[PDB]
Amino acid sequence: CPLMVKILDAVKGTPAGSVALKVSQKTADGGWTQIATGVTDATGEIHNLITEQQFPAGVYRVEFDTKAYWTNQGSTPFHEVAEVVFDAHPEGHRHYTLALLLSPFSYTTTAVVS
Amino acid sequence: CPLMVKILDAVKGTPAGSVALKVSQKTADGGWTQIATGVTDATGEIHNLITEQQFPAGVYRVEFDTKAYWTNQGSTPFHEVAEVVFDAHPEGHRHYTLALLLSPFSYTTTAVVS
Amino acid sequence: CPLMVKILDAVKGTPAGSVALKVSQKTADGGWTQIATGVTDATGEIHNLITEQQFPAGVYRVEFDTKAYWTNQGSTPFHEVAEVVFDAHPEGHRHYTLALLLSPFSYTTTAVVS
Amino acid sequence: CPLMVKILDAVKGTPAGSVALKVSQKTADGGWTQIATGVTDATGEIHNLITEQQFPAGVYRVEFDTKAYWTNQGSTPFHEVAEVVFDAHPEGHRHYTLALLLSPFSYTTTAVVS
Ligand SMILES: CC(C)(c1cc(Br)c(O)c(Br)c1)c1cc(Br)c(O)c(Br)c1
Ligand SMILES: CC(C)(c1cc(Br)c(O)c(Br)c1)c1cc(Br)c(O)c(Br)c1
């Protein structure tokens, strides 16, 4: 699997479970095609999000529903959504882990690229 | 001005100058209307980016072109853009500062709301 | 003033007011001399924390009492303090801004150096 | 093992290998006893840093030699050292992972607490 996520809650110091997300691929004319959805498990991860066959080079977007996560935690959030938009270069079995650190008014998006 | 940005370069320890961005307002059918653009000055800011009248309550997207910033610095970045999406409640001259901390494979988006 | 701080609360989206800190200068035998203290104002800052004359070249530690800040907010933090340790080169009126972003289980320490 | 680390390089998007660190425990009179050293492997981790027997409750400090890491990467760093100072509450087999995101002029210290 070429695309994984790891989400941590910076208020509690635990993985962020039950965070919903959507994965989209940019079209040539600049639009977006949704290709996958998922929800983090209690470890802040999702397994088998997409396959290598679904992951050519190009621009991708992962939308994390952080506003719902914070509302359910009981904290008013700033962001309406957490969008991570990146260029993928899969040639060579390069894998990507999108790491995300969440606070109600702040998040950090990092990548670990194999 | 109710919407400010402050961008920092975490590699150099300086404000991120000459970063292009665009501000868009969400439409009823889920689209986006571009309402302002600019390029940060040497302090990582854009003075007077939008007016009170241009900033009614609603969802906004500020798209920062971080890729070109890094290319110009000589690095190969992960993200295509930095996205900050939020619901604005400008009543009472409430003000929004979008702080952004940039590294080639990571950024942090923080909000300072009056 | 050559040494400034700017502290933000990532839970609330506001500057972190009423954070105690201490500034220490490293000694030859590896010890630490306290040279200044203060408490941030409502903008997350301490105006005029030290003078030019108090800030010769050398290694400094700024210790922020983030634990008590969080206890007072009602959260149970991870860190005992936030530590920022750096070698200062104040020649030419070079200025240092210590930016600090706080959550109960995470902080980011960034430097803006002129 | 009750204390682990995970270090990422935010410039390259890879784990930070070969980062040296020292672990110390605070004494009653406010001093420090070094109890362990280590160096991250190519995954940014260290295994078997300390034992549970070595890890009573108390104040601990992990000093990461990030200045040497950045010098060897070829980038001038801001911080002289990255110090993570925390209260440990091991009762119940609670484990701690110190996560660290490194840029030359910025780092983020987070904890994952089981
Ligand atoms: C404290 C705050 C929000 C900040 C707000 C304003 Br306005 C400033 O001018 C500066 Br200087 C700092 C900040 C921003 C970023 Br970006 C950081 O990486 C970290 Br750490 C802290
Ligand atoms: C989610 C978390 C805590 C993480 C924990 C483990 Br354990 C991992 O192996 C990986 Br990868 C990520 C993390 C860490 C850093 Br350093 C970050 O900059 C961000 Br954003 C998130």
Side-chain angles (χ1 to χ4, degrees):
Chain A
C1 178
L3 182 63
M4 292 132 298
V5 308
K6 182 77 177 183
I7 317 186
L8 311 177
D9 177 320
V11 169
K12 280 167 14 192
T14 64
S18 292
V19 179
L21 59 82
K22 303 200 263 233
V23 177
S24 299
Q25 193 181 200
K26 202 168 205 179
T27 72
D29 288 1
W32 296 99
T33 306
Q34 183 174 307
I35 62 172
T37 67
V39 74
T40 60
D41 65 20
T43 75
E45 301 175 18
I46 296 163
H47 307 190
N48 306 324
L49 201 44
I50 56 175
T51 70
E52 258 192 18
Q53 289 92 353
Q54 300 178 277
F55 194 58
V59 175
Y60 292 80
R61 170 179 86 179
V62 181
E63 305 171 73
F64 299 87
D65 190 353
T66 56
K67 180 176 183 190
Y69 175 81
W70 282 118
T71 302
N72 176 90
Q73 287 298 300
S75 295
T76 306
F78 177 73
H79 302 86
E80 191 74 352
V81 62
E83 294 192 359
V84 182
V85 186
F86 66 97
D87 311 314
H89 302 281
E91 177 202 5
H93 302 285
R94 181 140 47 222
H95 293 179
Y96 294 89
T97 296
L98 304 182
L100 193 63
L101 179 69
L102 302 185
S103 307
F105 273 65
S106 184
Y107 63 80
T108 297
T109 162
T110 315
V112 189
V113 183
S114 74
Chain B
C1 176
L3 184 66
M4 279 67 58
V5 307
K6 182 64 171 193
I7 314 178
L8 298 182
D9 178 325
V11 175
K12 283 167 49 193
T14 69
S18 289
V19 180
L21 63 80
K22 36 189 99 160
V23 183
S24 298
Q25 177 189 74
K26 199 161 190 185
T27 71
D29 68 19
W32 293 103
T33 313
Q34 189 181 280
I35 59 176
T37 66
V39 174
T40 58
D41 59 29
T43 76
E45 299 177 20
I46 299 170
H47 297 154
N48 292 324
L49 171 64
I50 64 173
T51 64
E52 204 184 77
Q53 169 77 39
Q54 289 180 290
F55 197 57
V59 178
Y60 291 82
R61 169 182 79 186
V62 188
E63 184 167 289
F64 301 82
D65 190 348
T66 51
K67 184 178 184 179
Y69 177 81
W70 287 121
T71 306
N72 179 77
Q73 295 286 313
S75 295
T76 56
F78 177 69
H79 302 93
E80 168 88 359
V81 292
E83 300 278 18
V84 180
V85 185
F86 66 105
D87 197 348
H89 308 275
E91 71 244 341
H93 291 115
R94 177 186 274 110
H95 298 286
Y96 294 84
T97 300
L98 309 188
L100 190 67
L101 177 64
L102 308 177
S103 308
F105 269 70
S106 188
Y107 63 84
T108 301
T109 161
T110 303
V112 185
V113 184
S114 64
Chain C
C1 176
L3 184 66
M4 279 67 58
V5 307
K6 182 64 171 193
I7 314 178
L8 298 182
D9 178 325
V11 175
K12 283 167 49 193
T14 69
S18 289
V19 180
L21 63 80
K22 36 189 99 160
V23 183
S24 298
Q25 177 189 74
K26 199 161 190 185
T27 71
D29 68 19
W32 293 103
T33 313
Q34 189 181 280
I35 59 176
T37 66
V39 174
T40 58
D41 59 29
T43 76
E45 299 177 20
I46 299 170
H47 297 154
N48 292 324
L49 171 64
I50 64 173
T51 64
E52 204 184 77
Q53 169 77 39
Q54 289 180 290
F55 197 57
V59 178
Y60 291 82
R61 169 182 79 186
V62 188
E63 184 167 289
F64 301 82
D65 190 348
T66 51
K67 184 178 184 179
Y69 177 81
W70 287 121
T71 306
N72 179 77
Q73 295 286 313
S75 295
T76 56
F78 177 69
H79 302 93
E80 168 88 359
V81 292
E83 300 278 18
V84 180
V85 185
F86 66 105
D87 197 348
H89 308 275
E91 71 244 341
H93 291 115
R94 177 186 274 110
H95 298 286
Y96 294 84
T97 300
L98 309 188
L100 190 67
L101 177 64
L102 308 177
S103 308
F105 269 70
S106 188
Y107 63 84
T108 301
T109 161
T110 303
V112 185
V113 184
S114 64
Chain D
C1 178
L3 182 63
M4 292 132 298
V5 308
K6 182 77 177 183
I7 317 186
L8 311 177
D9 177 320
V11 169
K12 280 167 14 192
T14 64
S18 292
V19 179
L21 59 82
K22 303 200 263 233
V23 177
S24 299
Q25 193 181 200
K26 202 168 205 179
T27 72
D29 288 1
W32 296 99
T33 306
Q34 183 174 307
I35 62 172
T37 67
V39 74
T40 60
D41 65 20
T43 75
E45 301 175 18
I46 296 163
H47 307 190
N48 307 324
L49 201 44
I50 56 175
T51 70
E52 258 192 18
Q53 289 92 353
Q54 300 178 277
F55 194 58
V59 175
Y60 292 80
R61 170 179 86 179
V62 181
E63 305 171 73
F64 299 87
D65 190 353
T66 56
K67 180 176 183 190
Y69 175 81
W70 282 118
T71 302
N72 176 90
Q73 287 298 300
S75 295
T76 306
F78 177 73
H79 302 86
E80 191 74 352
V81 62
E83 294 192 359
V84 182
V85 186
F86 66 97
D87 311 314
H89 302 281
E91 177 202 5
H93 302 285
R94 181 140 47 222
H95 293 179
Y96 294 89
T97 296
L98 304 182
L100 193 63
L101 179 69
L102 302 185
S103 307
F105 273 65
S106 184
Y107 63 80
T108 297
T109 162
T110 315
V112 189
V113 183
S114 74

